[PDB]
Write an enzyme that holds these catalytic residues in place. Sequence first.
Site, short mmCIF file in Angstrom:
data_model
loop_
_atom_site.label_atom_id
_atom_site.label_comp_id
_atom_site.label_asym_id
_atom_site.label_seq_id
_atom_site.Cartn_x
_atom_site.Cartn_y
_atom_site.Cartn_z
N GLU A 1 7.92 1.17 12.04
CA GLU A 1 9.00 2.12 11.82
C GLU A 1 8.34 3.49 11.99
O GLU A 1 7.72 4.01 11.07
CB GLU A 1 9.56 1.99 10.41
CG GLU A 1 9.71 0.55 9.89
CD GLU A 1 10.87 -0.21 10.53
OE1 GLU A 1 11.89 0.41 10.90
OE2 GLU A 1 10.75 -1.45 10.63
N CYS B 1 12.34 10.81 9.24
CA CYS B 1 12.00 10.10 10.47
C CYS B 1 13.11 10.30 11.50
O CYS B 1 12.85 10.54 12.67
CB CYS B 1 11.79 8.60 10.17
SG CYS B 1 12.85 7.83 8.83
N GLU C 1 7.59 15.71 16.95
CA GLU C 1 8.17 15.64 15.61
C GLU C 1 7.41 16.59 14.71
O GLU C 1 6.21 16.43 14.46
CB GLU C 1 8.10 14.21 15.07
CG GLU C 1 8.68 14.06 13.67
CD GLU C 1 8.56 12.65 13.13
OE1 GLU C 1 9.59 12.10 12.68
OE2 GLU C 1 7.44 12.09 13.14
N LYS D 1 0.86 -1.17 0.00
CA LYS D 1 0.00 0.00 0.00
C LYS D 1 0.91 1.23 0.00
O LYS D 1 1.64 1.47 0.96
CB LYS D 1 -0.90 0.03 1.23
CG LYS D 1 -2.24 0.74 0.99
CD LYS D 1 -2.10 2.22 0.68
CE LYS D 1 -2.12 3.06 1.94
NZ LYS D 1 -1.95 4.51 1.65
#
Lengths: 494, 494, 494, 494
Positions: free
Chosen positions: A262, A296, A393, A186
């Site tokens: 992750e 990330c 973040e 996906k």
Amino acid sequence: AVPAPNQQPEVFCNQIFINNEWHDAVSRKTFPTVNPSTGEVICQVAEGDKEDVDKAVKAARAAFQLGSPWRRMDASHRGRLLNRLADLIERDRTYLAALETLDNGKPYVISYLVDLDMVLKCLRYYAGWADKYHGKTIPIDGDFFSYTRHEPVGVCGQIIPWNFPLLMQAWKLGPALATGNVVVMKVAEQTPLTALYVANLIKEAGFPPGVVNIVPGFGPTAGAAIASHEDVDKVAFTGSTEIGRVIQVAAGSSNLKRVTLELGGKSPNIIMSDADMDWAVEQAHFALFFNQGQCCCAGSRTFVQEDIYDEFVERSVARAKSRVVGNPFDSKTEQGPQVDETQFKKILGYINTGKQEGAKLLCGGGIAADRGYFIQPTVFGDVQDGMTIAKEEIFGPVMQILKFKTIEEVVGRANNSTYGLAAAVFTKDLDKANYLSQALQAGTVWVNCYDVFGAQSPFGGYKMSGSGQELGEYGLQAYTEVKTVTVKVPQKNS
Amino acid sequence: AVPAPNQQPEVFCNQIFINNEWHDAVSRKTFPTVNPSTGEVICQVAEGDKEDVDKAVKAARAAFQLGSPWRRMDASHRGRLLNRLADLIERDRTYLAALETLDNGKPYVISYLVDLDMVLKCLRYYAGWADKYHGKTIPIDGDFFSYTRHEPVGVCGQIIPWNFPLLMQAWKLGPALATGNVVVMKVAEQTPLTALYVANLIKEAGFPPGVVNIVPGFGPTAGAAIASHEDVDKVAFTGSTEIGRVIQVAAGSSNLKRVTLELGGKSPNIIMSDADMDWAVEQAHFALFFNQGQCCCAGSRTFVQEDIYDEFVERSVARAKSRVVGNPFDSKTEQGPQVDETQFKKILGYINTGKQEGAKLLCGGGIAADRGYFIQPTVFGDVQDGMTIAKEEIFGPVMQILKFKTIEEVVGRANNSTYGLAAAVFTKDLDKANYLSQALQAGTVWVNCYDVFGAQSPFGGYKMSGSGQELGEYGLQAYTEVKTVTVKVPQKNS
Amino acid sequence: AVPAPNQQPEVFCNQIFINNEWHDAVSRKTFPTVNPSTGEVICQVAEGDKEDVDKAVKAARAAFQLGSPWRRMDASHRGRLLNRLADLIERDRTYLAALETLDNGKPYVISYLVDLDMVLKCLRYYAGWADKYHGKTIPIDGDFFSYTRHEPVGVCGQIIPWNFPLLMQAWKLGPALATGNVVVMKVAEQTPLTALYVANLIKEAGFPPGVVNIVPGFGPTAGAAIASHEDVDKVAFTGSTEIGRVIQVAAGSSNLKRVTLELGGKSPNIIMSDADMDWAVEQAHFALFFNQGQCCCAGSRTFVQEDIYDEFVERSVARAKSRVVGNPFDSKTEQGPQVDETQFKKILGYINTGKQEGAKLLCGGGIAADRGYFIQPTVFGDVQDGMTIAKEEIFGPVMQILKFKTIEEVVGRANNSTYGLAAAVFTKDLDKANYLSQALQAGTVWVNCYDVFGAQSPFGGYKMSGSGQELGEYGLQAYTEVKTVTVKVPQKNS
Amino acid sequence: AVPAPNQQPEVFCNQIFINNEWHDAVSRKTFPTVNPSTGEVICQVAEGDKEDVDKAVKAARAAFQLGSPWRRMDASHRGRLLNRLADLIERDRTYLAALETLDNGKPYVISYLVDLDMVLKCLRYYAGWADKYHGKTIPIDGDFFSYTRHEPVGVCGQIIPWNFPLLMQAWKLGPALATGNVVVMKVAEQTPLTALYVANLIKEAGFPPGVVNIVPGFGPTAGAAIASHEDVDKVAFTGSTEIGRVIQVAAGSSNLKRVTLELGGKSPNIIMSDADMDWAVEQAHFALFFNQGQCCCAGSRTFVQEDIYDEFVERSVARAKSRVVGNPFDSKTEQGPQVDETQFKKILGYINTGKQEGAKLLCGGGIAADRGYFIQPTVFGDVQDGMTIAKEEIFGPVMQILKFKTIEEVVGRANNSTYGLAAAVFTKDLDKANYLSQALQAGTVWVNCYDVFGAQSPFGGYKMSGSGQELGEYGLQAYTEVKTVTVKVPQKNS
């Protein structure tokens, strides 16, 4: 030496990929994909849902049946196929780099020299692992002969983000296909084009039908479908820390499928007073601003020792101010637009929050253009651990600079985070480098550098940044199932 | 906290060890073993020769026969036995340390706290490997199942030196026994007592007869017989660079048996200007003077950066002069006597050679006592690359201090040697440490330390310092034979 | 689907290869290479000697210098080069297959579908290892950080045979280059052409000058020069059991360079009474007759259970008589000529000896054509263990069939040999397969198949068939040198 | 030779274990533990709950703090401790075997010779692994030095069953402690006694306070507390397939902690027509009835080929009828009682269900004693795939024998299950053994044997039988966290 790009490359693939064939959504629906540089719609793309996922999974399961061409295939051949796919991608390098930029926003120079080079190196690396991941012959007690077989886990559902469309795809296909698995992928709604074109190359490479199946669409629909499916053996999700929880829940409530996550992070970049000032400043800038700050493992908490704090900040601000923002296709452009309006607004909110909290805005802080999702390189100084911008973040071009005194101090503050994806240390001292690399609770710690990923170096996280790994030999563990066969023998001897 | 020693321990074992029984030499001959501290004869020991070695080999081969106790035994059990041996050695630790010192000359404190501790750690470490050295299941092309079995090489001849009698024994027995081999060991004529005692503990531990057979005697006779024997599958020698050549020749002309050599060296200890002075001096002293300078890996070439040369030397000399030489049983003694007369004289010759070449004699340089083989801690300054004391292994308490300027310079000088056993680097700079550790052509490179050996750390050499290794997982490769079994299966699948 | 060959391909390379340049012998001398099918001279070839080898070695050592292109080069890049070299070989596949056959004698079909396929699979397999042979981080005792680096051994001298010219070259270059070593290769005087052409491809692939150097010539001269050279770090010989002794002697007498030997054998092929008769017969025929019987691991001792002896022999003889001998370029040709006159005569001698000893000649036994070195497929029945043809490697199309009764019997008789390269077992019983596979003392043991080699499966030998290995992960150990670095750290933690 | 047991051993430990100290539940609560042989209450045990779990976790985290004794401790030393613990367990072997039987119901003979032997072998196996799980030095691209550190995962929650009290504890503590982690263990409410006593030995062995903390109690309370705790880094559950889903849900909703599950199964034991009848019958009996049929990997689906079905069944029934049920302390007892009343009744229900479905009851089928939880050895013939007793884990002395014809048929039927823990194949045919061992979808596949577990052989499951592994080198992966350190160096060379 970068080849001239086609600033408006044609889109050849915009449908669902199953059994090496292009299908429309069962609902016959689609969705638009935006060019973050202009705000304009690039084209329409098939909107997959549960039913389409089911079509993909059954196709994968069928290709994974005992005796199928993919199962009987020699492991060295799978390697051959991966190398083939890489050669194809290299052939269409200039086009893919362009298409990647058109849909993501990142500079074409970066997509070509960085993104695509890494894609190639990743696939070629793993091609080599295909026939080199051995099982074991175990010296068990008694008159028995015992060994292990490393068989594929099976049908692997893989959900990938938009910050590195082509690369994320490679990081997932590489280990999975090298170990014999089948994939139901996906891709991100924001960046589905490049992935789909690669699926076309997967067919041309000669991969059996159903080995790789891509289903473009939305996370709540297609994503959750994969994570919940009763026939998916493993799901690998990479994205926001919020959606990851949803996936681990939907997977543990469905069929106890294996789950690897992750997630994001608030990675600390520590600059000791003895660091090479020029080098530290330039790397800290790269540490954060890279890929429009959409990493990330971005160095979102730049800790700087007091004795050099002032000089560091001054230089950092200068570097920020000189950072060229604009058309990603222009060779002079360092920073492109943010991926979409949602993120664009989400960032502006953080900047505003930073100002509210008393963080010293040193430069930028607002829109960088009246068209597209561009944001000026922003730098906040005198940031405190308690501030929001020092905990959440941001995922954008916003740098936080914190001041510290002792090495004992910075370790505690660096480790004082729910995240633990990465961290870095800039120092000339041997003892300090070893002290810190061991004390920092991060999956990856860089010394006098940042964002150095090798196709051979593992990438995992501590705490809530994730579990399991990508890249390196460790990457093969997650896509491997271990079977122990213990045979009774006449009389064992050493 | 060291137990009080029995300065004149009784000798219980002084014969040949075969099939867990004590035998005299067929010739009935014997030889004396001297106490290097007094020059007096400790006792007489069986002088084995070719006929005795033949008895040992036959016994070993019998013990290695398919279906024998030692061959059928579970791998985990071999570990159990190694651990048992270790427990017995620790039971008799105080005694063995004394006996080690009696026959070797090294300080009792060092034999107890160092030598024996390392012997225990070595055997216990290897006990753990006995059932963890796996083979592999290989994903070969075609409809086949291919795997590997790690079988013992067989009858292993092992010849060990006198500088570390007990330890050398442990380093050899550990990996050989852990992998299921059998051993015919030849111990040093100067230090045979401790090894034979341990053979007694080997029988007590419960090892099958013939698994370990020890043959005391001389190298030209017993040593050569082992190396030449038609039924010995592998020979491992550790000693002078001269005798090693003899062995590889005698082995390649006999039956193409496998051969590993552990020779000497002229290891360089580089001290950069930014090194911690106090630490570097103390460690540079230890690097050379340890075990009466009788180390294969001794730091015989102490390179010092010019800016700190004078200070370094001054401090080095002071430390040398303060070094207490005397009865090895006295707690205060730092340095005992040299192993025997031959070496004693050999070193005095080198000392004189140093003076002839124009090396600056800074301290010592003569006999340290009128009884025994004691030599004064000697230090030569302003040593040049071409000098003999700067090229040949002295194996005594004689330090060579050389001066250098750049880092590029010292690398070339350090690497300009026929030896490449070890090397060291003392610096505070991270880049310097990495630059050097990578550039130095040595089997082991220590950073800000020296002579740091772990049971788990491999010990090998480059160039003419040897081949193959002892310690670590690598030590097992040399005592393992790899068999590949490739079975034809109905139909292969991942 | 085999492409039509050029039965008289042009020869482009016939000189010494140093620093990617073609040289003539210093002596300006040359020697002829014959076409075993007609006895005609194909062309002249430079005859290298010690001086030429010295040129090659100095070139090799130069390319191996710290900082050179080949040393700084990324490991993954060495992989890229190996794959590139593979691609070039595949481009000129049809040509090389022809040239292989022209100079060796083997059928062109076999050179194309087998020899070159394996050469390609070998190089590609090894290319993948380039950046996957990790070192280790060791949990050593005390406050230290210990790790290992797998560095290249250095200058590797490699001497290869004539039975598989191209393949032997791949088996040696593959692991050596993938680990970063440099090579000074000596090719067979009988088959040097193909190796020399590949050297041209090594240049075209982009390998730095001096990384691979080939020196055609004679074994007593060129071979011994490499084996004795004071600057060669390792020598790998593959050939007759007699010359191997010379090499290990010349090497242990020169500079203690590392030595690996790949010798001959008298491999036993055990056919149990419950074996699939059709399969066993066809595979046993293949096991010996393959490549004109010129295999180091040839199944030269065919042991057959009594209950099926007669039937087996009858079928074996029929298959032998139907085996087509003739021009290697004809599709119907299964067996071509023997490599040269020397071997041709050596085989006829063994055949005559077989008849003298009372072995029952069942078919063939003499010359197969008045031109070339063709020999009829010969089969000897009722062979006894003590007979010469049952003990010495014939290396020709001569089959020995022995009769046995018990399984305990055949194990003893099979292991009753100075060799131990390979063996095989044909049976349907599980226990019998495992029993024999463990009891047989051979480097490789095939079950219900023979001569099954994968680029991933190791190939070594027991006793006097050799030491060390080629192919598989184990192949990398022999070409790697292990350096341990132990760093002093502030405070170690788990 | 088994030592005479104390049929009523004194209980010394019955509280919560935290920081090497015994505590009462905060609630001062307790619960009774029953002797399944008499139904009598053995003694009272502290009933731990969330608050108690919190005390344990805080203790654990404290012991895991950087710089703590457990963290600074040499890896080799952790090995020492594990061996010490095993020595203490061996000292109190006879006591613990009795205590195990007293609380579990299993025969004392089996407790002593099997359970405790495996505990010792497991602890000693793992002690060996303590200093042997290396990291890697990676050949990453560019001028960098990259390596990995295998650090402990942290605070490990472990929930263990009652079928093998001591062994389950060993299987969990072994790999966790060997890798440096800390444990908060929850033991079964039915069998908490032995585990608590071993905790007393953990203190005696010398493990730092808080390294191992045991909290007895109920699953809904203590178990869920551990699985849900925000400070637990990993939770390993082993039990029913129903409770496992709960744990993976409570964990993914808490703090994304790592989760490993070891669930039940309906393992198929396939008996081909060529199997050794005597052997297969006895082994098939053992496969199911062992430990009162209370094995996660019990052979609950015995498939028998038609040609031997009748004879097989006859012999199986005879063995079942002869199987002695009674006091676990009597040497003649083969089967003791079931663990508790809940299981006792749950089994009777299944037996009833078997009869309802048309399964042919061949023997037993009801209570075996009016006192305790004894059940007669029950056997059902002509069972069909659709039947309940042929799909659901009974966990009792109830055998199901199914009939089949083809090998292709049995594969499909065997693999037709939601479970995939273990499988077995009894045959004399090589190809059949290989075909089935590869085709069967189970974590473990035994050939001509069953329930063969070596401390060195891994134990994991496919599908819904679990994920992750226990035992072997693979066991350490789950308790290890991989950190990558990538340092910038001056200039990289091979």
